[PDB]
């Protein structure tokens, strides 16, 4: 059976997805580049980001990633935390991030770590993690 | 000055965006086709949709619409309601909706009406409505 592979395929493809959070009891969504270690997703951002404040107030997040109307994609539900591990920060660093961060040593660079509870594969089957 | 025009340009372009809602105190986002009357956005969906239940429980919604990493787009914050007006339903009907609805007379077809409070134009300037 191919669900983990179908999901990994999506996660191993294009990087831009949508990260949604709750912000003062209202939804907020932003385009973000996604990296990963196995099924754990990571987004590089500035530590003063409102998404970081959102996560500070409610850790539940939702991800749409992978997307013609009939392309396959995934939806991820899980809890987020902030990750400042130098090894992961240096691993994921790349020049597209220069829009928002200076360099891998920028003190403002943090990762949002998303620990998935449920991954739905659309085109739903799901994986519980 | 060109903000209303910049926004209308986005709203008059490709139709697929992201509709985010709050679902049991957690964020949820879905790809949806967007229609509009002036700056009021509408999405056609099935009346048993969980997005409808979400909106039933918290009317605040967020839209990303319009999107290369440096394409322009908009973010919309506002309150949603359900619209069953036959004139609008027939106006927006088209065959892409056949994935989710039978025909314009399908009793399951409703519109989600999004009354914007704030529209941000990204590439932010904003309009209050
Ligand atoms: C394809 C793509 C990929 C991207 N990838 C990344 C990424 O990997 N990492 C990254 O950091 N960023 C990335 N971005 C940028 C990110 O989507 C935006 O910076 C987004 O606004 C971040 O949301 P935030 O709440 O953290 O933003 P913040 O900068 O903290 O605040 C902006 C938010 O506040 C609100 N706002 C906007 N303007 C005003 C204002 N005038 N007054 C009051 N409120 C306002 C809006 O809701 C907006 O989303 C990407 C953008 C694109 C298009
Ligand atoms: C480009 C694009 C455009 C689209 N445009 C439209 C549109 O205009 N109108 C429309 O109606 N739809 C549209 N869709 C489909 C829409 O995005 C999905 O149907 C989406 O899941 C709707 O969210 P919902 O909560 O209303 O879905 P519902 O069908 O009510 O429920 C599905 C949701 O429940 C959760 N779920 C999924 N599977 C399970 C399961 N196995 N067990 C428990 N929970 C589950 C997921 O979070 C999922 O989003 C579009 C899709 C794409 C890709």
TrEMBL record, chains A, B:
Keywords assigned: FAD, Flavoprotein, Nucleotide-binding
Domain of life assignment: Bacteria
Name this polypeptide is given: General stress protein 26
Keyword Nucleotide-binding belongs to the record: yes
PANTHER family in alphabetical order: PROTEIN BLI-3
GO terms assigned for molecular function: nucleotide binding
Matches recorded under Pfam families: PNPOx_N
Chain positions recorded as FAD binding sites: 23, 28, 31, 33, 44-45, 50-51, 75, 100, 120, 124
InterPro entries hit by this protein: Pyridox_Oxase_N, Split_barrel_FMN-bd, Stress-Dev_Protein
Domain Pyridoxamine 5'-phosphate oxidase N-terminal: 3-122
Organism: Bacillus anthracis (anthrax bacterium)
């Amino acid at each position: 059976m191919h669900l983990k592979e179908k999901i990994t395929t999506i996660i191993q493809g294009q990087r831009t997805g949508v990260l949604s959070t709750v912000r003062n009891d209202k939804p907020h969504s932003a385009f973000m580049m996604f990296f990963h270690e196995d099924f754990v997703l990571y987004v590089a951002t500035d530590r003063q980001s409102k998404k970081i404040t959102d996560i500070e107030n409610n850790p539940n997040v939702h991800v749409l990633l992978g997307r013609k109307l009939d392309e396959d994609y995934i939806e991820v539900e899980g809890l987020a935390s902030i990750e400042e591990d130098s090894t992961l920060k240096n691993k994921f660093w790349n020049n597209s991030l220069k829009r928002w961060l200076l360099r891998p040593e920028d003190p403002n660079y943090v990762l949002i770590k998303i620990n998935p509870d449920t991954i739905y594969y659309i085109d739903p089957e799901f994986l519980r993690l």
